[PDB]
Design a protein around this ligand. Structure first.
Ligand SMILES: [Mg+2]
Ligand SMILES: [Mg+2]
Ligand SMILES: [Zn+2]
Ligand SMILES: [Zn+2]
Lengths: 162, 242, 107, 185, 52, 116, 107, 69, 77
RNA sequence: AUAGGUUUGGUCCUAGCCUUUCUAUUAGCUCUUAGUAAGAUUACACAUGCAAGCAUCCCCGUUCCAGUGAGUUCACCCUCUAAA
């Protein structure tokens, strides 16, 4: 047994199960919900489960978690200029509110794909570096010069042996 | 209308090649890690089979065959200063990123003051030494030597043969075309069109046999087996191309 | 395993160490299980095994002998599953150890 | 045995193994507990085999090479392309090198079968005639003789700067002759 | 943070000395009319300077 | 503590082991070490050629050209490499070395005609 | 613009024993490299209330100033977005109590 | 040493040049040592021997092989 | 090696700095070709400045980025 | 860590020391062919060979590499900018 009725939050796979990513200009993601009422079960389960995913996707955003505020909370967001986006949370499912927040603060999948393509283009393994951010230090290790003369011996072709 | 890289013609030629879901995606000897025993329904199984068939068809999109070539010794920028003094082939190229190896500029020099652009074989060897890929060995493969080729053709096993032939040379090399022609000629003798149904095959088999009129064995095998629609399609293709 | 016929399987003998106790535990475990045909007859769906060596080509092991549902098993959010933390740690490679699966009395 | 290829084809192999492997069927009497991460070095020694012979050297006539594919199949997994190195089995370093060489020869000749999951090629163009490795219109100076920058080839310079240099550097007497040839014996 | 005041003061004093003691091109640069050398430095002269 | 990032001064250092000659370009200032405070650290250079004589060189001039435009000096190795590469004309030092080789061959012909 | 790192940040007002200023704290989540859980972590900050609107007990946004004009102060409290206790609903949200609609809305 | 294995061990105090000073035990039938001796000391630990942590090695600047009758 | 302020040994600071070998015609060819190469290198440095300008233009003034930003703003609206 | 040894007349849970082996530095012992990386461990102290030249004197490397672990969240970012 595990220490948690919902141990999905501690299973590794949940970390990689992320997907949504906020914009590069977000600042604070103030969100309030209710826990005692049984009306907004969807939004409750959403805020309870699908949150560490977005947090691990980018832990550069502020979080606000309240207990009991009002039967009709909200989801106050913030943009570059620190605007105030208003929207209700009551009477909302989980995937619905997830898609809503992804469309509002989250970035479109096209932008993420473009960023991934740009990062791949930035990758240039053809370069040579003595073991750190690249592979094959010098041309000696790879099919070229003598494979590390400091270890493998050499015949009379070299100097100082005649 | 030859059109070697056509659409409908190549699609029909691939259709003539037996799909065989069990042969194309045969359980290879790879890192057989314990997979997941998911429970799929009828619709999901049908969709997965369709995806596998599409992947196998995409696997039959290569290679091209356009005869052999000749290693040309280019002579561009001549400098009457060296004339046989500085050798070792100096290469000063800028490796960008998204550029095919055929469009690179491997400025290979010569002992004289000329300016070569890397011979075909030398260019291929340098490309292989640079960025390898699925297999692809530097020098010629020992698997396709004289005695090795004879042993491979005598034991009847043209799956790994074509697999390595595609994953070793380039789609326009001398030894490549030679080995492919030898394998096709060996396949022609005695009907056995079946082993070539799990790898690159349409390189220069049906195309070459239709250009040189060698569809006798294939027609005999088709008549002995079955498939009347395929026979009519082949007759129509022969009437059109010829 | 040799007397049973198994040829390859790992076992983490954690907790206590005893012969009769281990045999009784193994018997209890093998008594409360469901075979492939039994699992297929229970759930109904086909027991497909996506072989990693092959492409997207499914291969069914035990086919159904009665029920045939059109809708597959759903993949809802946060599936309730309890697993061991040491297994995930060893899979990720958190701790260090040159004695887990290196050179032991294998085969 | 001289010209072997007969042990496996005889009844000795059936009476010995027949279906079990040869590398796993071994009991090392070293420091009990678990086999070591490094095994014995040279199988033979001088003229006798000191201690328990190698799991491979115990067999007198069977060799290690592509000719004996049964040994390679037994040493390699029945469904994986992983080679069980010597530290895992328990074989002399000589036999380990022999097995490595035999496996290399077999893989270079085309013995061990294996399906390669191929993908797209390295280039999109397929024609030995692209302009990147064909030719290029030469330059007018190059056609006339000396390429661009006419100061590349030798040119008899004036005498004023020669007198200047002779006036400067004098202790290092180094007189030349004339325009040297361009050949090379 | 505590800035190394001893080292800073030492370096500042050295720099102030080197600046205020700025010698013109005559004190230590006094060229000799025989030995063909310069005081302070004490280095040699090029072969051309044997008589220039 | 204060950098400079002004004019560059490419300095070399053939550091390595015996029977192993390998270049090592290091771009920095004139008043800076090699492994100390620098401006840009670029990859090394391949002196001797690889197998079957194929001296491959990776032209990493992308940022070097920008630094030159912003102010960057060169040394003898970088100058000779740029000259014998392709962008700059053939370095005059190497052309004159070829001329000296021609003179040496002429002297060898003279010696062969004189001696025997 | 804001020379400091944080630009916009929300926090509660607590410490106000000063002139034209109000200490504000920010609550953030920190992940453990073993427990795999986001734990709540608070950090006190110094704002700048140019006029002191409310006393204490209010969660309001902050605007980072260009350059700190003292020592550690960096934020500027110039707008109370909401009032603790009298939380406002999205639409037709009147100052009501907690879980008790004392102020009849839709009026 | 102990009650059951009533032997005649020669426990002598050995001061280390580093600084520490404790008791040690020299193995081998017959203690041929005396007092003034600069011999190497290894970290050998004997099984049944209370108050023993190190031993004397007759190798470093002493003897080569082992005593054989 | 030495470091300015050193006791400096005595087995080298007592010899004149002799100049290298200089052949009149060969050295004059050296210098003529070196002047030509230096002029060409200065021209190529000016061309490198121009190319850096062109690259900065293609990067910043690239209408593609501005159009993408405008489309993103419209999508946000 | 998949074995466990070590209590009690014996067993279970339960917890202390330890190998079985990879090893980096080494005591003795024995001590082939050909070739390489190291011969300051101690922020101990130092003979002899020395190690900074030079371009027409202007002048730079000398704040370079070369060694040590005294100290030891300077060894990386956001808002951006100092000579050049
Ligand atoms: Mg007892
Ligand atoms: Mg320290
Ligand atoms: Zn052996
Ligand atoms: Zn090196």
């Amino acid at each position: 047994p595990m220490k948690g009725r919902f141990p999905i939050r501690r299973t590794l796979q949940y970390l990689s199960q992320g997907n949504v990513v906020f914009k590069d200009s977000v600042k604070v993601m103030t969100v309030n919900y209710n826990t005692h009422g049984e009306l907004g079960e969807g939004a409750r389960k959403f805020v309870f489960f699908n949150i560490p995913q977005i947090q691990y996707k980018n832990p550069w955003v502020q979080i606000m978690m309240f207990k009991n505020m009002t039967p009709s909370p909200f989801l106050r967001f913030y943009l570059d200029s620190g605007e105030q986006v208003l929207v209700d949370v009551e009477t909302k499912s989980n995937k619905e509110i997830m898609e809503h927040i992804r469309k509002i603060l989250g970035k479109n999948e096209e932008t993420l794909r473009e960023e991934e393509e740009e990062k791949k283009q930035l990758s240039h393994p053809a370069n040579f570096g003595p073991r750190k951010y690249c592979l094959r230090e010098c041309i000696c290790e790879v099919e070229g010069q003598v494979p590390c003369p400091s270890l493998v011996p050499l015949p009379k072709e070299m100097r100082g042996k005649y | 209308k030859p059109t070697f890289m056509d659409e409908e013609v190549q699609s029909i030629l691939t259709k003539m090649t037996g799909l065989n879901l069990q042969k194309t995606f045969k359980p290879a000897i790879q890192e057989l890690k314990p997979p997941t025993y998911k429970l799929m329904t009828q619709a999901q199984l049908e969709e997965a089979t369709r995806q596998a068939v599409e992947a196998a068809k995409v696997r039959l999109k290569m290679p091209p065959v356009l005869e052999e070539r000749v290693p040309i010794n280019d002579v561009l920028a001549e400098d009457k200063i060296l004339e046989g003094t500085e050798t070792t082939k100096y290469v000063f190229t800028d490796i960008s990123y998204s550029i095919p190896h055929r469009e690179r500029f491997i400025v290979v020099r010569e002992p004289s003051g000329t300016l070569r652009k890397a011979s075909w074989e030398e260019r291929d060897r340098m490309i292989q030494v640079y960025f390898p890929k699925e297999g692809r060995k530097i020098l010629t493969p020992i698997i396709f030597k004289e005695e090795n080729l004879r042993t491979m053709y005598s034991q009847d096993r043209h799956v790994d043969v074509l697999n390595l032939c595609f994953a070793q040379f380039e789609p326009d090399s001398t030894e490549y075309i030679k080995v492919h022609h030898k394998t096709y000629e060996d396949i022609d003798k005695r009907g056995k069109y079946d082993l070539l149904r799990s790898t690159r095959y349409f390189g220069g088999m049906v195309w070459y046999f239709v250009n040189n009129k060698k569809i006798d064995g294939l027609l005999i095998d088709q008549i002995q087996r079955d498939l009347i629609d395929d026979a009519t399609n082949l007759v129509q293709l022969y009437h059109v191309l010829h | 395993c040799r007397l049973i016929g198994i040829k390859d399987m790992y076992a983490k003998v954690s907790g206590s160490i005893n012969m009769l106790s281990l045999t009784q535990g193994l018997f209890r475990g093998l008594s409360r299980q469901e075979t492939h045909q039994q699992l297929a007859d229970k759930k109904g769906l086909h027991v497909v095994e996506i072989r990693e060596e092959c492409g997207p080509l499914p291969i069914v092991v035990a086919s159904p002998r009665g029920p045939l549902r059109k809708d597959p098993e759903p993949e809802d959010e946060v599936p309730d599953v309890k697993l061991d933390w040491e297994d995930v740690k060893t899979a990720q490679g958190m701790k260090r150890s040159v004695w887990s699966n290196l050179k032991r009395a294998a085969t | 045995k001289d010209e072997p290829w007969k042990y496996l084809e005889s009844e000795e192999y059936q009476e010995r193994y027949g279906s079990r492997p040869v590398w796993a069927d071994y009991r090392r009497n070293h420091k009990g507990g678990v086999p070591p991460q490094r095994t014995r070095k040279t199988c033979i020694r001088r003229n006798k085999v000191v201690g328990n012979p190698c799991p491979i050297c115990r067999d007198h006539k069977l060799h290690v090479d592509f000719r004996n594919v049964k040994l390679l199949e037994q040493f390699v997994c029945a469904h994986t392309g992983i080679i069980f190195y010597a530290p895992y089995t328990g074989v002399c370093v000589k036999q380990h090198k022999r097995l490595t060489q035999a496996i290399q020869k077999a893989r270079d000749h085309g013995l061990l079968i294996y399906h390669i999951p191929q993908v797209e090629p390295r280039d999109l163009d397929f024609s030995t005639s692209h302009g990147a490795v064909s030719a290029t219109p030469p330059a007018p100076t190059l056609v006339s003789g000396d390429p661009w920058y006419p100061w590349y080839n030798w040119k008899q310079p004036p005498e004023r700067e020669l007198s200047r240099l002779r006036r400067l550097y004098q202790g290092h007497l180094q007189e030349e002759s004339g325009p040297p040839p361009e050949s090379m014996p | 943070v505590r800035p190394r005041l001893i080292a800073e003061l030492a370096r500042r004093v050295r720099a102030l000395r080197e600046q205020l003691n700025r010698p013109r091109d005559s004190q230590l640069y006094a060229v000799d009319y025989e030995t063909l050398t310069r005081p302070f430095s004490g280095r040699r002269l090029p072969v051309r300077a044997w008589a220039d | 503590k204060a950098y400079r990032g002004g004019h560059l001064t490419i300095r070399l250092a053939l550091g390595g082991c015996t029977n192993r000659p390998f270049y090592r370009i290091v771009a920095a200032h004139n008043k800076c070490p090699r492994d100390g405070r620098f401006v840009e650290q670029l990859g090394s250079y391949d002196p001797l050629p690889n197998s079957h004589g194929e001296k491959l060189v990776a032209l990493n001039l992308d940022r070097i050209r920008h630094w030159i435009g912003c102010g960057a000096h060169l040394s003898k190795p970088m100058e000779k490499l740029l000259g014998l590469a392709g962008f700059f004309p053939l370095h005059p030092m190497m052309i004159t070395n070829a001329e000296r080789l021609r003179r040496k061959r002429a002297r060898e012909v003279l010696l062969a005609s004189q001696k025997t | 613009r804001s020379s400091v790192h944080a630009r916009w940040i929300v926090g509660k007002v607590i410490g106000t024993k000063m002139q034209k200023t109000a200490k504000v704290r920010v609550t953030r989540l920190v992940l453990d490299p073993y427990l795999l859980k986001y734990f709540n972590k608070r950090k006190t900050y110094f704002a700048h209330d140019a006029l002191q609107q409310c006393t204490v007990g209010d969660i309001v946004l902050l605007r980072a100033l260009p350059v700190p004009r003292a020592k550690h102060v960096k934020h500027e409290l110039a707008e109370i977005v909401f009032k603790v206790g009298k939380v406002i609903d999205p639409v037709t949200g009147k100052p009501c109590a907690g879980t008790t609609y004392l102020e009849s809305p839709l009026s | 040493p102990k009650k059951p294995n009533s032997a005649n061990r020669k426990c002598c105090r050995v001061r280390l040049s580093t600084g520490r000073e404790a008791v040690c035990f020299i193995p081998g039938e017959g203690h041929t040592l005396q007092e003034h001796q600069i011999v190497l000391v290894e970290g050998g630990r004997t099984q049944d021997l209370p108050g023993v942590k190190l031993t004397v090695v007759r190798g470093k600047y002493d003897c080569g092989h082992v005593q054989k009758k | 090696r030495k470091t300015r302020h050193d006791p400096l040994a005595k087995s080298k600071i007592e010899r004149v700095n002799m100049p290298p070998a200089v052949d009149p015609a060969e050295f004059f060819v050296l210098m003529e070709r070196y002047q030509h190469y230096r002029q060409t290198v200065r021209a190529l440095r000016m061309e490198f400045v121009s190319e850096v300008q062109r690259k900065v233009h293609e990067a910043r003034a690239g209408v593609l980025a501005e159009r993408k930003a405008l489309k993103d703003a419209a999508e946000h609206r």
